[PDB]
Write a protein that binds this ligand. Structure first.
Ligand SMILES: NCc1cncc(Br)c1
Length: 165
């Protein structure tokens, strides 16, 4: 199971780790992808997760979009986890660099409550442009299920832990 995590609350845990490496080791029931509405896994966590699946996540995602159309910002869909997890929960957090409503970050984290345990990144953090300290606060105040957060950047992980109220 999950190891080396620091407990933040009753249900939120955090570790300085590469989420792809964490997914390969653990093979969680659910790995969360930091998706966009088009499921175009080009960069950040999405590009890294997709590259780990040898592009199978993108092929599956393109078929999903061809059938269903784009997701909503704040929404999600459950697809295969391929070689990383049983399932991948593709969650769309608001992209601040695209002028999207930061208030949608709470709606995005609410998707986690449909799963008892998840391996996840901080939503809207990184290339999505939101403040990761704000994302962690929304996570602990929204998610009630067991969430194991993987933060790739060591310096950011340290900042998040040392500033956690
Ligand atoms: N080394 C794979 C990787 C690349 N980029 C971001 C993350 Br998170 C992980």
């Amino acid at each position: 199971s999950f190891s080396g995590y620091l407990k933040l609350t009753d249900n939120v845990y955090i570790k300085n780790a590469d989420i792809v490496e964490e997914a390969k080791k653990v093979k969680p029931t659910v790995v969360v992808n930091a998706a966009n509405v088009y499921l175009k896994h080009g960069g950040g966590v999405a590009g890294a997760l997709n590259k780990a699946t040898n592009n199978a996540m993108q092929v599956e995602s393109d078929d999903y979009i061809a059938t269903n159309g784009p997701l909503k910002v704040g929404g999600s869909c459950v697809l295969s986890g391929h070689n990383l997890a049983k399932h991948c929960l593709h969650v769309v957090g608001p992209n601040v660099n695209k002028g999207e409503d930061i208030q949608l970050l709470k709606s995005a984290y609410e998707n986690f409550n449909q799963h008892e345990v998840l391996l996840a990144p901080l939503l809207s953090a990184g290339i999505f442009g939101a403040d990761p300290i704000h994302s962690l606060r929304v996570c602990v105040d929204t998610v009630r299920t067991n969430v194991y957060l993987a933060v790739f950047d060591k310096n950011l992980y340290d900042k998040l832990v040392s500033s956690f109220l």
